[PDB]
Amino acid sequence: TEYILNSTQLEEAIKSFVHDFCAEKHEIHDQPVVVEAKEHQEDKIKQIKIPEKGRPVNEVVSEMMNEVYRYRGDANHPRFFSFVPGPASSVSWLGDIMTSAYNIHAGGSKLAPMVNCIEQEVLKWLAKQVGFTENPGGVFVSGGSMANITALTAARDNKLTDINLHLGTAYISDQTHSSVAKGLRIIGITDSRIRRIPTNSHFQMDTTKLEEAIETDKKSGYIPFVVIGTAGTTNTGSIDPLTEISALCKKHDMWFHIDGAYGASVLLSPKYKSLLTGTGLADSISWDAHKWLFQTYGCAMVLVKDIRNLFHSFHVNPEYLKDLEDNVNTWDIGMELTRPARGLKLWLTLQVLGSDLIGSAIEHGFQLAVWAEEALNPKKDWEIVSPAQMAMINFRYAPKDLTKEEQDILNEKISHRILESGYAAIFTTVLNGKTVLRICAIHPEATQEDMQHTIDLLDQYGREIYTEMK
Amino acid sequence: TEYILNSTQLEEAIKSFVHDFCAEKHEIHDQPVVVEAKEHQEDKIKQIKIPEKGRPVNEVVSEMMNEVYRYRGDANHPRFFSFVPGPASSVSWLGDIMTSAYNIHAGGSKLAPMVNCIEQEVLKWLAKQVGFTENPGGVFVSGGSMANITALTAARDNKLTDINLHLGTAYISDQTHSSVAKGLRIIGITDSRIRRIPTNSHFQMDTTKLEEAIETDKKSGYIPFVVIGTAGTTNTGSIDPLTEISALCKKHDMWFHIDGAYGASVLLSPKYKSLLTGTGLADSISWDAHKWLFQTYGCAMVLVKDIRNLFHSFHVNPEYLKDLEDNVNTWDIGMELTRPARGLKLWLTLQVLGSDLIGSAIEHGFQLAVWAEEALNPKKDWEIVSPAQMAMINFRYAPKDLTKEEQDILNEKISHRILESGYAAIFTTVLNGKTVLRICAIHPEATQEDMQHTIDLLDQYGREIYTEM
Ligand SMILES: Cc1ncc(COP(=O)(O)O)c(/C=C/C(=O)Cc2c[nH]c3ccccc23)c1O
Numbered sequence: 001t002e003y004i005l006n007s008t009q010l011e012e013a014i015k016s017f018v019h020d021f022c023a024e025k026h027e028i029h030d031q032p033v034v035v036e037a038k039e040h041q042e043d044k045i046k047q048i049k050i051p052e053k054g055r056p057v058n059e060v061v062s063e064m065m066n067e068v069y070r071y072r073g074d075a076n077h078p079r080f081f082s083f084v085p086g087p088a089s090s091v092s093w094l095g096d097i098m099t100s101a102y103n104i105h106a107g108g109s110k111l112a113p114m115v116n117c118i119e120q121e122v123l124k125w126l127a128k129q130v131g132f133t134e135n136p137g138g139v140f141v142s143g144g145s146m147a148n149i150t151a152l153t154a155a156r157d158n159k160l161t162d163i164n165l166h167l168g169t170a171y172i173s174d175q176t177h178s179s180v181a182k183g184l185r186i187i188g189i190t191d192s193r194i195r196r197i198p199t200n201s202h203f204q205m206d207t208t209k210l211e212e213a214i215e216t217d218k219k220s221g222y223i224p225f226v227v228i229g230t231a232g233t234t235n236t237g238s239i240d241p242l243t244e245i246s247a248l249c250k251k252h253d254m255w256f257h258i259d260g261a262y263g264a265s266v267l268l269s270p271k272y273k274s275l276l277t278g279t280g281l282a283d284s285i286s287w288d289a290h291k292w293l294f295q296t297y298g299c300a301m302v303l304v305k306d307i308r309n310l311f312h313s314f315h316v317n318p319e320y321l322k323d324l325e326d327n328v329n330t331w332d333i334g335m336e337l338t339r340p341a342r343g344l345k346l347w348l349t350l351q352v353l354g355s356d357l358i359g360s361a362i363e364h365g366f367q368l369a370v371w372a373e374e375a376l377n378p379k380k381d382w383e384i385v386s387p388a389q390m391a392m393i394n395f396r397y398a399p400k401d402l403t404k405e406e407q408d409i410l411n412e413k414i415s416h417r418i419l420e421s422g423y424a425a426i427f428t429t430v431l432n433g434k435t436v437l438r439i440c441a442i443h444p445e446a447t448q449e450d451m452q453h454t455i456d457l458l459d460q461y462g463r464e465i466y467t468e469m470k
Numbered sequence: 471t472e473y474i475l476n477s478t479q480l481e482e483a484i485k486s487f488v489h490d491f492c493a494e495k496h497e498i499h500d501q502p503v504v505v506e507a508k509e510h511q512e513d514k515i516k517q518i519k520i521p522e523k524g525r526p527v528n529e530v531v532s533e534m535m536n537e538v539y540r541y542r543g544d545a546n547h548p549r550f551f552s553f554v555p556g557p558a559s560s561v562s563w564l565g566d567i568m569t570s571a572y573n574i575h576a577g578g579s580k581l582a583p584m585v586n587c588i589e590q591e592v593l594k595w596l597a598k599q600v601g602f603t604e605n606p607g608g609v610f611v612s613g614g615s616m617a618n619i620t621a622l623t624a625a626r627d628n629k630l631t632d633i634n635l636h637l638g639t640a641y642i643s644d645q646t647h648s649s650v651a652k653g654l655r656i657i658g659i660t661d662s663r664i665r666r667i668p669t670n671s672h673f674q675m676d677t678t679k680l681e682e683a684i685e686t687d688k689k690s691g692y693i694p695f696v697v698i699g700t701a702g703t704t705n706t707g708s709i710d711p712l713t714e715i716s717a718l719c720k721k722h723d724m725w726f727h728i729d730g731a732y733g734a735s736v737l738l739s740p741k742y743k744s745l746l747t748g749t750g751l752a753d754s755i756s757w758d759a760h761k762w763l764f765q766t767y768g769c770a771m772v773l774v775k776d777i778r779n780l781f782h783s784f785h786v787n788p789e790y791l792k793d794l795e796d797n798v799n800t801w802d803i804g805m806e807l808t809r810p811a812r813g814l815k816l817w818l819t820l821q822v823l824g825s826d827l828i829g830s831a832i833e834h835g836f837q838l839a840v841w842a843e844e845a846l847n848p849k850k851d852w853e854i855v856s857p858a859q860m861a862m863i864n865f866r867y868a869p870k871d872l873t874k875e876e877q878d879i880l881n882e883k884i885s886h887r888i889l890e891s892g893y894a895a896i897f898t899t900v901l902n903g904k905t906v907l908r909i910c911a912i913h914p915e916a917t918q919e920d921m922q923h924t925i926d927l928l929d930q931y932g933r934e935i936y937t938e939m
């Protein structure tokens with residue numbers, strides 16, 4: 001049809017975009033991190049509607065570039081310091097283009113033997129970094145949330161049966177990411193059987209309060225089956241006592257899952273790999289590549305010490321898929337059946353950049369946060385709530401002649417101010433009952449001035465609003 | 471840097487691939503559907519290792535094209551007739567390139583308000599086609615398996631509580647896809663509380679046996695909470711009695727989920743949309759775009775009649791994300807938090823191609839299977855186990871002077887023979903206790919000859935192996 005793009009029309013539409021984008025992204029350090037959409041932009045989109053007849057390709061492409069993609073909080077920006085930024089390598093993008101082109105049906109071996117071989121090679125390599133030396137296994141999932149649900153399902157099916165599984169209790173901390181408890185609820189573990197253990201001043205799980213909670217539930221008649229330790233808390237980037245938790249798990253016959261969606265990448269850092277000592281003691285661990293392995297959304301991994309545990313929870317044997325089966329299929333490792341070759345783009349990056357460069361790029365993240373801390377220390381009335389920890393730091397502006405409520409409002413306005421300035425992206429979070437500014441800097445192309453000028457800009461906004469409030 | 475690509479190296483590396491691929495895929499109709507890898511290919515890959523130092527980009531690129539991507543069972547091929555093929559539009563590929571470029575964090579509105587607005591517009595439109603007219607809602611998930619688990623999770627939380635949910639029973643058919651029961655087990659529903667209802671000769675769920683199972687479980691003290699009807703069975707492409715199932719669900723206060731991962735796309739076909747009458751009666755429905763909406767893996771949708779049910783099961787309010795919030799975030803309707811704008815590539819395809827063309831391309835799928843059946847009718851000893859149904863058909867070559875075991879082995883060798891010929895991809899399945907050849911043709915650029923020549927080739931292989939025995 002006159003609407004279908006021919007091989008020449010397609011190739012030109014693609015090159016047109018690839019060219020225009022590379023030029024635009026080349027100037028990223030001099031672009032506002034946040035580009036606000038106007039008040040009537042939502043109605044502009046709602047009027048386009050779904051057409052019965054086709055439209056000129058280059059007309060639709062430009063429409064998306066100008067009316068959709070433009071208005072965003074670019075987490076690819078070197079001065080995006082909020083949540084967990086996505087400083088994806090350009091090589092990862094290349095991987096997506098190649099993977100999406102062939103559109104090979106991954107999550108199955110016979111139909112793509114070398115595609116599966118590539119993924120397993122990376123998974124074996126990652127498993128080596130974790131400390132799994134016997135018979136590991138894994139699957140490239142979409143997110144760490146899916147990584148957690150996958151791992152926890154294997155944990156549930158390993159420690160519980162079809163008759164007593166409603167007596168299972170899980171154990172987390174008050175700093176554990178929300179997706180863990182959300183995943184537990186999905187797999188049938190109600191909130192009434194999820195224990196939230198308090199953390200110390202370093203935001204690490206209190207293993208003493210953990211054990212007595214385990215002891216209480218066991219005495220009560222529950223069956224404690226899993227403890228979720230976190231290596232790189234979302235808030236402060238803290239690391240739970242991995243060794244201490246492992247000791248308790250072996251004692252009480254429980255599954256040890258390490259939620260390392262963020263911090264697991266530190267295992268590739270020669271300098272800081274020691275920080276994650278004891279990960280090999282875990283039975284399963286999550287690890288997001290679109291985080292600190294510089295991949296595009298979404299490419300996350302789940303790794304188990306014993307692959308048999310993943311096979312037990314997710315294997316199927318229908319009449320179909322009989323000619324597609326020793327050599328495990330990814331669909332038998334759960335929990336999806338049709339999958340794109342997510343891990344291939346990670347392979348491409350590892351080959352083009354190398355493990356050394358990626359390790360150092362991660363170490364740069366640590367340095368960026370330390371630079372932020374060094375710039376805050378000398379400034380008056382600036383308080384460090386959590387020190388520079390794993391490329392992560394929390395702080396607030398707190399003049400003493402203000403009440404706590406006012407201090408919260410103050411730091412909120414400071415975040416608001418620097419956001420509209422367009423120089424950096426910094427949002428607020430809550431820590432120890434106080435509204436706090438948070439910085440997570442992991443972009444390899446971010447410099448000392450970037451961190452220094454940001455704090456300098458924040459300090460200016462701070463003392464400015466402080467006077468305005470009086 | 472030395473291993474870091476600059477804007478000129480990047481743009482050149484991409485265009486080089488885009489150029490070489492388009493040329494190669496332009497000649498796809500004259501390429502073997504399956505390209506087998508040699509015995510030494512696995513060790514060749516294992517020897518590459520993970521390097522500490524970087525490598526030249528185009529050297530790595532060419533290595534993957536020649537040693538990885540090449541050896542595959544191309545489901546993009548117009549003569550890939552196995553399972554559920556993936557005849558993805560080139561526009562969809564373009565969508566992935568744009569989406570992956572900006573790398574915008576979707577699954578959240580405040581950080582990408584117009585990206586989310588686009589997805590909701592597509593979801594609302596799809597909801598209109600399904601029959602949800604009140605206050606629908608949905609999410610672009612990775613797969614239809616994730617579509618089912620998302621929907622079934624909402625069903626569980628809607629009909630059960632934290633105190634009685636271990637008494638819940640679910641009901642499927644013997645033709646229901648494996649991912650449904652697999653999803654049920656994941657959300658805590660054990661096999662001992664999953665009922666598999668027999669199907670008729672048309673592979674449709676026996677609603678009479680369905681009700682008697684519900685009555686039995688309810689009388690025993692169980693709590694029947696969901697029935698999963700399928701619109702487009704994976705095997706034969708049959709459609710469960712949606713109306714009959716809905717009546718029972720309303721009668722027994724149960725959640726009605728329609729698994730339309732494949733067949734839901736038929737709603738876009740003016741000719742065949744009537745086949746899916748009653749989809750609006752469901753409480754939830756799955757729908758995969760990387761199947762019959764011609765998208766790349768992976769782009770699937772889950773739609774619920776009442777969006778409040780999705781919010782109840784997946785909403786979270788942690789300390790962080792407080793500056794990110796009514797206007798629901800996609801993470802509040804589960805079950806993932808970080809997401810790529812999966813739905814954007816579906817938007818691009820709908821705008822560039824239009825809903826009319828896509829509807830016709832689906833109708834072409836119906837025609838391809840009919841052409842396959844028409845070519846089989848005159849051929850001797852060729853048996854139709856399931857007629858051409860929704861671009862899907864099951865058949866076997868069965869000479870009468872053969873045993874039941876021999877007939878199975880025969881059709882297996884026939885599949886094996888045509889696979890290695892490279893002309894087409896056809897695998898076997900089991901149906902009514904018989905090994906059967908299956909064809910699913912949904913590629914818009916597949917012709918009458920393709921189906922005719924394929925059947926002609928199968929008959930040849932059939933009459934040759936029959937002679938060997
Ligand atoms: C009703 C029905 N429901 C759910 C699913 C699962 O969806 P995902 O596969 O998206 O999770 C299906 C899927 C059926 C298939 O079979 C798809 C398929 C295409 N190429 C393959 C290659 C190998 C195995 C399976 C496939 C299906 O047919």
Ligand SMILES: Cc1ncc(COP(=O)(O)O)c(/C=C/C(=O)Cc2c[nH]c3ccccc23)c1O
Binds near residue numbers: 145146234261575809
């Ligand atoms: C330990 C830990 N475990 C799991 C996750 C799961 O995240 P995904 O499910 O998204 O993989 C996380 C992630 C925490 C985040 O912080 C998510 C996030 C990244 N960028 C964002 C932008 C807006 C809102 C949220 C995010 C995490 O920090």
Ligand SMILES: N[C@](CF)(Cc1c[nH]c2ccccc12)C(=O)O
Binds near residue numbers: 088444
């Ligand atoms: N690859 C660059 C080119 F500068 C920078 C970059 C983003 N993530 C990275 C991770 C490691 C090394 C470099 C990077 C890009 O912006 O695409």
Ligand SMILES: N[C@](CF)(Cc1c[nH]c2ccccc12)C(=O)O
Binds near residue numbers: 559560828915
């Ligand atoms: N778009 C074509 C053109 F050649 C064919 C195609 C694949 N899925 C489709 C869905 C609708 C219309 C055409 C197609 C391609 O090969 O990419």
